[PDB]
Amino acid sequence: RVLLALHDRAPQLKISDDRLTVVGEKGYSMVRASHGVRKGAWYFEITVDEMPPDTAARLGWSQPLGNLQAPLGYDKFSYSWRSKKGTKFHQSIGKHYSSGYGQGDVLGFYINLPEDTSEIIFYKNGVNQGVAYKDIFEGVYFPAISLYKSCTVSINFGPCFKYPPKDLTYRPMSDM
Amino acid sequence: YPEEADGTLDCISMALTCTFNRWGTLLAVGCNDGRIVIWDFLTRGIAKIISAHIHPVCSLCWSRDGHKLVSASTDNIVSQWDVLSGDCDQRFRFPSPILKVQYHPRDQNKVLVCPMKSAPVMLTLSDSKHVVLPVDDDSDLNVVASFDRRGEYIYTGNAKGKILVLKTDSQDLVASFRVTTGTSNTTAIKSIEFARKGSCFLINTADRIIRVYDGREILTCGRDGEPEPMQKLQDLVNRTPWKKCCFSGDGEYIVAGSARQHALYIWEKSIGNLVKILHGTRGELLLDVAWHPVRPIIASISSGVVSIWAQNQVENWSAFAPDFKELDENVEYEERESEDEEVDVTS
């Protein structure tokens, strides 16, 4: 079943006992999921339930050989987008993208991955936020979460999505 | 304010007296065989050795210009020197041996010299026109006198107890009082010293009591006054007679040396309590005590040994870090994630 992992953790990180929710640690360290792909156009959902005032939390795809302890966006393995002031990051450098995300949304992420016979798109209430960058590298693509003080976000992989868009032909990760 | 031992000087034996300039750079160590050894502070060296005489050099006094000492001995010569190459400019072979010399602070042609027996008479440099300072009684045989701070007056002191004040050159009798020593028995005077800011001054009496007065108070008293003292100092436990007194660099901390025990006592002008007793080699007898005007370090002359008494800055040097304050337990704050004025620089 498409779920989380056991040793994909820091000891200050708390992967919750439902394997559908991560509990935030007040610093900045990276937790990641367990079921990813390498080639194709795929999709999952992160349901952001509750948020404090004046937060900082970054979400996006990642590759497992990155940093286990970083805020997301520190490496060339992964991209990110911040909950405050809406910034895309390449090795965590301020490059203004949008305005960030708040309380009560679903951050359901799209990937695009061609091959000789690649972009990362973020959604938020179905809104096509645009394109972060183009032609990303080769590897296994896990999701990645790093959080603020102990807030509440939920993950989702079932085909009964909360916000299914109608602009691209995507597939759920639970087909694995 | 001095609290340590800090070092001493085994350079030239038989030290007898010293004093300083306005700036506090050199040290004119008076010697028994007619010498003035000059030692430096910031370089710790002996620059010039003036082999002046062969007789005990008793008194010394620096002037304001930084060029003209004045001394006397049992050689009984009112000498003078210069620190460039040891130039004895003048030589006054006089009778009646000397106790203390003293300039006027800015009219340095006029020096004030205390003989052995009769009244202090104001000498000069060039001419022999000594200005007779009229003491009335003249039966006391030991009368001491001095200026004020700015050289604006002349203060005197007999051995009976009567104090007279004259103008610095024309001798206006403006103040007259006898000291309130005991009830029926008065006492003599041995020294009167003055500060570098203000007109407070001490009366080194001889019933083991120091008395302190101000200049404005006695100028308000004037002729036939009864000035009460600002402060009465003594030491009733150890029953100690006094040798030499002085002042601090601001006229706040009186430094009076003993005459029996080789110890310094330090008071306050305002409150009037003892603050610290200093000590040294217990087997000496102390004669002269020098205070440094801009930085509080004391010199003590006994048995040819002169000692430097600082406080070492044990607090710390804090030159580098006005910043960087200390947190005792491991305090963590790791939540966080992130042309107006024209002053004459050429002044």
Neighbouring-strand partners of residue B256? B245, B265
Note which residues in 143-172 of chain A have CB less than 8 A from chain B: 149
Q: Which helix (H) or strand (E) holds B6?
A: none
Query: How far A28 CA lies from chain B's nearest CA (Å)?
Result: 9
Structure-token match 């790791």, residue found? B334
Structure tokens belonging to residue B287: 């004669």
Please say whether the beta carbons of B264 and B211 come within 8 A. no
Taking CB atoms and an 8 Å cutoff, what residues of chain A touch B337? 28, 56, 71
A173 vs A42: CA distance, rounded Å: 7
Structure-token match 């007789």, residue found? B55
DSSP string, B68-81: ---EE-SS-EEB--
N residues, chain B: 347
| Three-class SS state of B159 | coil
Structure tokens belonging to residue A168: 């691209």
Using the beta-carbon criterion (under 8 Å), do A56 and B335 form an inter-chain contact?
no
Residue B97, burial from CB neighbour count under 10 angstroms (0-12, 13-18, 19+): middle
Following CA atoms B100, B104, B110, B115 in sequence, which dihedral angle do they give, to the nearest 10 degrees? -20
Residue among B30, B21, B23 nearest B51 (CA)? B30
* Phi, psi values for residue B9, rounded to 5°: -130, 105
| Assigned architecture for domain A1-176 | Sandwich (2.60)
Residue among A40, A29, A41, A116 nearest A67 (CA)? A29
Q: Which helix (H) or strand (E) holds B217?
A: helix B215-221
List the determination method.
cryo-EM
Nearest residue on chain B to A25, alpha-carbon basis? B335
Structural domain boundaries in chain A: 1-176
Neighbouring-strand partners of residue B175? B165
| Three-class SS state of B154 | strand
Residue among B122, B118, B70, B74 nearest B94 (CA)? B74
Following CA atoms B150, B156, B162, B163 in sequence, which dihedral angle do they give, to the nearest 10 degrees? -10
A67 vs B227: CA distance, rounded Å: 86
Query: How far A107 CA lies from chain B's nearest CA (Å)?
Result: 22
DSSP string, A12-75: T-EE-TTSSEEEPPSS---EE-S--BSSS--B-EEEEEE--SS---EEEEE-TTS-SSSPTTSS
B28 vs B61: CA distance, rounded Å: 9
Taking CB atoms and an 8 Å cutoff, what residues of chain A touch B334? 26-27
Strand order in the sheet with A110-111: A110-111, A120-124, A127-131
| Three-class SS state of A173 | helix
* Phi, psi values for residue B131, rounded to 5°: -100, 110
B231 vs B225: CA distance, rounded Å: 18
What letters, b where the CB count within 10 A reaches 16 and e where it falls short, cover B132-148? ebebeeeebebbbbbbb
B206 vs B160: CA distance, rounded Å: 11
Residue A93: Cβ within 10 Å count: 10
A96 vs B180: CA distance, rounded Å: 89
Taking CB atoms and an 8 Å cutoff, what residues of chain A touch B332? none
Query: How far B327 CA lies from chain A's nearest CA (Å)?
Result: 20
Structure tokens belonging to residue B56: 């005990």
Note which residues in 13-32 of chain A have CB less than 8 A from chain B: 26-28
Strand order in the sheet with A45-50: A14-15, A21-23, A152-156, A45-50, A105-107
Please say whether the beta carbons of B277 and B264 come within 8 A. yes
CA angle B243, B249, B252 (to 5 degrees): 75
Residue among B176, B169, B174, B117 nearest B147 (CA)? B169
Backbone gaps in chain B, preceding residues (C–N over 2.5 A)? 338
Query: How far A27 CA lies from chain B's nearest CA (Å)?
Result: 6
B175 vs B164: CA distance, rounded Å: 6
* Phi, psi values for residue B8, rounded to 5°: -155, -170
Structure tokens belonging to residue A138: 């080769």
DSSP string, B22-77: SS----EEEETTS-EEEE-SSS--EEEEE---SS---EE---SSSS---EE-SS-E
Nearest residue on chain B to A27, alpha-carbon basis? B335
Residue A175 carries which DSSP code?
G
DSSP string, B146-175: EE-SSS-EEEEE-SSSEEEEEETTT----E
Using the beta-carbon criterion (under 8 Å), do A28 and B335 form an inter-chain contact?
no
Using the beta-carbon criterion (under 8 Å), do B337 and A56 form an inter-chain contact?
yes
Note which residues in 313-342 of chain B have CB less than 8 A from chain A: 334-335, 337
All domains of chain B in start order, with CATH: 8-309 (2.130.10.10)
